[PDB]
Amino acid sequence: FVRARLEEGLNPNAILVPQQGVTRTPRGDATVLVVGADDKVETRPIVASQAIGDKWLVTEGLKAGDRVVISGLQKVRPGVQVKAQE
Amino acid sequence: GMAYLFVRLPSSFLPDEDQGVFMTMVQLPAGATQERTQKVLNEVTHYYLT
């Protein structure tokens, strides 16, 4: 029985966070490190949606234009100032 | 004053020697794959090589 990829809902708007930048907290809770204009890292809890590609679709908690703080998990403890790179 | 310097004197284990080599350790964040780490190395390497 051949592999059948069957097209589906084709989500109109998907929050796709590189599964790099996706760090759950608390237990099983996606914590995105996206740093706002203050450039003081603030990890904003969310729930990554089903895993896809290398990234997480996340149904909630994040918005468009959010700069994901993805790497730098050492130089960034929460609240610290940060200079973005994308 | 003999007793004066004996105490002011910071003590060590042993003199460290430059041995012709050393090591640099690489740890990434959690859940991170080797490719991530790997890129770090050529960065590491490229520092050394260059």
Side-chain angles (χ1 to χ4, degrees):
Chain A
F1 316 158
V2 63
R3 298 186 300 281
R5 186 174 302 104
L6 192 149
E7 187 175 3
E8 290 306 320
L10 170 61
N11 186 27
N13 58 344
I15 304 302
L16 306 178
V17 55
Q19 301 163 343
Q20 182 188 359
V22 183
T23 65
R24 297 282 182 183
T25 293
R27 298 179 64 87
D29 298 344
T31 60
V32 172
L33 206 154
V34 164
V35 60
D38 295 344
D39 294 349
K40 291 180 177 178
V41 293
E42 174 173 354
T43 186
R44 292 196 290 274
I46 60 173
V47 176
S49 302
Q50 177 59 258
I52 298 170
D54 63 350
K55 297 180 177 74
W56 286 95
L57 172 58
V58 177
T59 54
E60 72 291 9
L62 294 176
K63 277 68 181 181
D66 304 345
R67 299 180 189 176
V68 184
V69 174
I70 304 186
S71 61
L73 286 180
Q74 290 67 357
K75 56 181 63 177
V76 168
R77 291 177 180 171
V80 181
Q81 292 174 337
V82 166
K83 283 69 180 183
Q85 289 184 336
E86 298 184 350
Chain B
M2 178 182 70
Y4 174 83
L5 297 166
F6 175 84
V7 293
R8 180 185 294 283
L9 181 63
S11 65
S12 63
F13 183 66
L14 288 181
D16 290 350
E17 299 296 327
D18 175 351
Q19 293 183 339
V21 298
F22 58 88
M23 292 176 290
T24 307
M25 64 175 289
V26 177
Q27 188 65 71
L28 279 66
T33 63
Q34 60 176 23
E35 178 179 354
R36 309 185 46 74
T37 298
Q38 187 58 67
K39 183 169 176 291
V40 178
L41 299 172
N42 296 343
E43 291 187 352
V44 175
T45 303
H46 187 284
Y47 177 73
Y48 294 105
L49 290 178
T50 66

mmCIF file with all atom_site columns, all heavy atoms in Angstrom, chain A residues 20 71-74, chain B residues 27-30 36:
data_model
loop_
_atom_site.group_PDB
_atom_site.id
_atom_site.type_symbol
_atom_site.label_atom_id
_atom_site.label_alt_id
_atom_site.label_comp_id
_atom_site.label_asym_id
_atom_site.label_entity_id
_atom_site.label_seq_id
_atom_site.pdbx_PDB_ins_code
_atom_site.Cartn_x
_atom_site.Cartn_y
_atom_site.Cartn_z
_atom_site.occupancy
_atom_site.B_iso_or_equiv
_atom_site.pdbx_formal_charge
_atom_site.auth_seq_id
_atom_site.auth_comp_id
_atom_site.auth_asym_id
_atom_site.auth_atom_id
_atom_site.pdbx_PDB_model_num
ATOM 1  N N   . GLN A 1 20 ? 14.821 24.948 17.663 1.00 0.00 ? 20 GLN A N   1
ATOM 2  C CA  . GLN A 1 20 ? 15.902 25.526 18.434 1.00 0.00 ? 20 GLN A CA  1
ATOM 3  C C   . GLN A 1 20 ? 15.400 26.438 19.533 1.00 0.00 ? 20 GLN A C   1
ATOM 4  O O   . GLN A 1 20 ? 15.630 26.164 20.716 1.00 0.00 ? 20 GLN A O   1
ATOM 5  C CB  . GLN A 1 20 ? 16.788 26.358 17.544 1.00 0.00 ? 20 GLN A CB  1
ATOM 6  C CG  . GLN A 1 20 ? 17.908 26.881 18.352 1.00 0.00 ? 20 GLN A CG  1
ATOM 7  C CD  . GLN A 1 20 ? 18.784 27.898 17.609 1.00 0.00 ? 20 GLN A CD  1
ATOM 8  O OE1 . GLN A 1 20 ? 18.543 28.193 16.451 1.00 0.00 ? 20 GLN A OE1 1
ATOM 9  N NE2 . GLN A 1 20 ? 19.780 28.402 18.261 1.00 0.00 ? 20 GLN A NE2 1
ATOM 10 N N   . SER A 1 71 ? 18.706 31.199 19.964 1.00 0.00 ? 71 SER A N   1
ATOM 11 C CA  . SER A 1 71 ? 19.982 30.774 20.494 1.00 0.00 ? 71 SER A CA  1
ATOM 12 C C   . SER A 1 71 ? 20.374 31.711 21.625 1.00 0.00 ? 71 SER A C   1
ATOM 13 O O   . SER A 1 71 ? 19.538 32.469 22.131 1.00 0.00 ? 71 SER A O   1
ATOM 14 C CB  . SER A 1 71 ? 21.009 30.801 19.376 1.00 0.00 ? 71 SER A CB  1
ATOM 15 O OG  . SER A 1 71 ? 21.131 32.110 18.878 1.00 0.00 ? 71 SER A OG  1
ATOM 16 N N   . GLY A 1 72 ? 21.652 31.664 21.992 1.00 0.00 ? 72 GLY A N   1
ATOM 17 C CA  . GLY A 1 72 ? 22.244 32.525 22.998 1.00 0.00 ? 72 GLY A CA  1
ATOM 18 C C   . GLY A 1 72 ? 21.767 32.147 24.380 1.00 0.00 ? 72 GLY A C   1
ATOM 19 O O   . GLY A 1 72 ? 21.778 32.958 25.306 1.00 0.00 ? 72 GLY A O   1
ATOM 20 N N   . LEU A 1 73 ? 21.383 30.891 24.539 1.00 0.00 ? 73 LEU A N   1
ATOM 21 C CA  . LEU A 1 73 ? 20.746 30.455 25.761 1.00 0.00 ? 73 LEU A CA  1
ATOM 22 C C   . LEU A 1 73 ? 21.639 30.578 26.984 1.00 0.00 ? 73 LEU A C   1
ATOM 23 O O   . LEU A 1 73 ? 21.166 30.322 28.099 1.00 0.00 ? 73 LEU A O   1
ATOM 24 C CB  . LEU A 1 73 ? 20.201 29.059 25.599 1.00 0.00 ? 73 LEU A CB  1
ATOM 25 C CG  . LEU A 1 73 ? 18.942 29.090 24.739 1.00 0.00 ? 73 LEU A CG  1
ATOM 26 C CD1 . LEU A 1 73 ? 18.410 27.700 24.586 1.00 0.00 ? 73 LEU A CD1 1
ATOM 27 C CD2 . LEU A 1 73 ? 17.898 29.978 25.381 1.00 0.00 ? 73 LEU A CD2 1
ATOM 28 N N   . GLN A 1 74 ? 22.885 31.011 26.799 1.00 0.00 ? 74 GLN A N   1
ATOM 29 C CA  . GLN A 1 74 ? 23.814 31.249 27.898 1.00 0.00 ? 74 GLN A CA  1
ATOM 30 C C   . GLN A 1 74 ? 23.855 32.720 28.284 1.00 0.00 ? 74 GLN A C   1
ATOM 31 O O   . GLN A 1 74 ? 23.614 33.081 29.441 1.00 0.00 ? 74 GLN A O   1
ATOM 32 C CB  . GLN A 1 74 ? 25.190 30.764 27.480 1.00 0.00 ? 74 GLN A CB  1
ATOM 33 C CG  . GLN A 1 74 ? 25.263 29.274 27.397 1.00 0.00 ? 74 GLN A CG  1
ATOM 34 C CD  . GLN A 1 74 ? 24.420 28.685 26.275 1.00 0.00 ? 74 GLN A CD  1
ATOM 35 O OE1 . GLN A 1 74 ? 23.704 29.395 25.563 1.00 0.00 ? 74 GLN A OE1 1
ATOM 36 N NE2 . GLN A 1 74 ? 24.496 27.370 26.125 1.00 0.00 ? 74 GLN A NE2 1
ATOM 37 N N   . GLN B 2 27 ? 30.093 23.209 25.230 1.00 0.00 ? 27 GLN B N   1
ATOM 38 C CA  . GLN B 2 27 ? 28.760 22.781 25.624 1.00 0.00 ? 27 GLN B CA  1
ATOM 39 C C   . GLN B 2 27 ? 27.759 23.783 25.086 1.00 0.00 ? 27 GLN B C   1
ATOM 40 O O   . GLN B 2 27 ? 27.956 24.997 25.204 1.00 0.00 ? 27 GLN B O   1
ATOM 41 C CB  . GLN B 2 27 ? 28.603 22.669 27.132 1.00 0.00 ? 27 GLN B CB  1
ATOM 42 C CG  . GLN B 2 27 ? 27.283 22.040 27.492 1.00 0.00 ? 27 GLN B CG  1
ATOM 43 C CD  . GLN B 2 27 ? 27.200 20.619 27.025 1.00 0.00 ? 27 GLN B CD  1
ATOM 44 O OE1 . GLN B 2 27 ? 27.861 19.741 27.568 1.00 0.00 ? 27 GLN B OE1 1
ATOM 45 N NE2 . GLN B 2 27 ? 26.444 20.393 25.962 1.00 0.00 ? 27 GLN B NE2 1
ATOM 46 N N   . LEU B 2 28 ? 26.696 23.271 24.519 1.00 0.00 ? 28 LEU B N   1
ATOM 47 C CA  . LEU B 2 28 ? 25.636 24.083 23.981 1.00 0.00 ? 28 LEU B CA  1
ATOM 48 C C   . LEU B 2 28 ? 24.464 24.089 24.921 1.00 0.00 ? 28 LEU B C   1
ATOM 49 O O   . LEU B 2 28 ? 24.463 23.414 25.950 1.00 0.00 ? 28 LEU B O   1
ATOM 50 C CB  . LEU B 2 28 ? 25.185 23.534 22.635 1.00 0.00 ? 28 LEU B CB  1
ATOM 51 C CG  . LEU B 2 28 ? 26.004 23.881 21.401 1.00 0.00 ? 28 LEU B CG  1
ATOM 52 C CD1 . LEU B 2 28 ? 27.330 23.228 21.546 1.00 0.00 ? 28 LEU B CD1 1
ATOM 53 C CD2 . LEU B 2 28 ? 25.341 23.429 20.105 1.00 0.00 ? 28 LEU B CD2 1
ATOM 54 N N   . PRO B 2 29 ? 23.443 24.795 24.588 1.00 0.00 ? 29 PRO B N   1
ATOM 55 C CA  . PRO B 2 29 ? 22.196 24.626 25.311 1.00 0.00 ? 29 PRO B CA  1
ATOM 56 C C   . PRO B 2 29 ? 21.632 23.232 25.171 1.00 0.00 ? 29 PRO B C   1
ATOM 57 O O   . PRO B 2 29 ? 22.180 22.366 24.486 1.00 0.00 ? 29 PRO B O   1
ATOM 58 C CB  . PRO B 2 29 ? 21.289 25.658 24.659 1.00 0.00 ? 29 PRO B CB  1
ATOM 59 C CG  . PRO B 2 29 ? 22.158 26.654 24.200 1.00 0.00 ? 29 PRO B CG  1
ATOM 60 C CD  . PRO B 2 29 ? 23.400 25.992 23.745 1.00 0.00 ? 29 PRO B CD  1
ATOM 61 N N   . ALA B 2 30 ? 20.508 23.029 25.823 1.00 0.00 ? 30 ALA B N   1
ATOM 62 C CA  . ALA B 2 30 ? 19.912 21.712 25.922 1.00 0.00 ? 30 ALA B CA  1
ATOM 63 C C   . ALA B 2 30 ? 19.097 21.383 24.682 1.00 0.00 ? 30 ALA B C   1
ATOM 64 O O   . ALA B 2 30 ? 18.605 22.278 23.991 1.00 0.00 ? 30 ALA B O   1
ATOM 65 C CB  . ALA B 2 30 ? 19.041 21.648 27.165 1.00 0.00 ? 30 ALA B CB  1
ATOM 66 N N   . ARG B 2 36 ? 24.374 22.106 15.281 1.00 0.00 ? 36 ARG B N   1
ATOM 67 C CA  . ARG B 2 36 ? 24.604 23.267 16.115 1.00 0.00 ? 36 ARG B CA  1
ATOM 68 C C   . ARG B 2 36 ? 26.016 23.211 16.687 1.00 0.00 ? 36 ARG B C   1
ATOM 69 O O   . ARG B 2 36 ? 26.895 23.979 16.280 1.00 0.00 ? 36 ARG B O   1
ATOM 70 C CB  . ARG B 2 36 ? 23.546 23.297 17.217 1.00 0.00 ? 36 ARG B CB  1
ATOM 71 C CG  . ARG B 2 36 ? 22.109 23.150 16.672 1.00 0.00 ? 36 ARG B CG  1
ATOM 72 C CD  . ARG B 2 36 ? 21.126 23.319 17.802 1.00 0.00 ? 36 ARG B CD  1
ATOM 73 N NE  . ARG B 2 36 ? 21.486 24.471 18.616 1.00 0.00 ? 36 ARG B NE  1
ATOM 74 C CZ  . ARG B 2 36 ? 21.346 25.739 18.295 1.00 0.00 ? 36 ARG B CZ  1
ATOM 75 N NH1 . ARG B 2 36 ? 20.902 26.176 17.038 1.00 0.00 ? 36 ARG B NH1 1
ATOM 76 N NH2 . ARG B 2 36 ? 21.745 26.510 19.316 1.00 0.00 ? 36 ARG B NH2 1
#
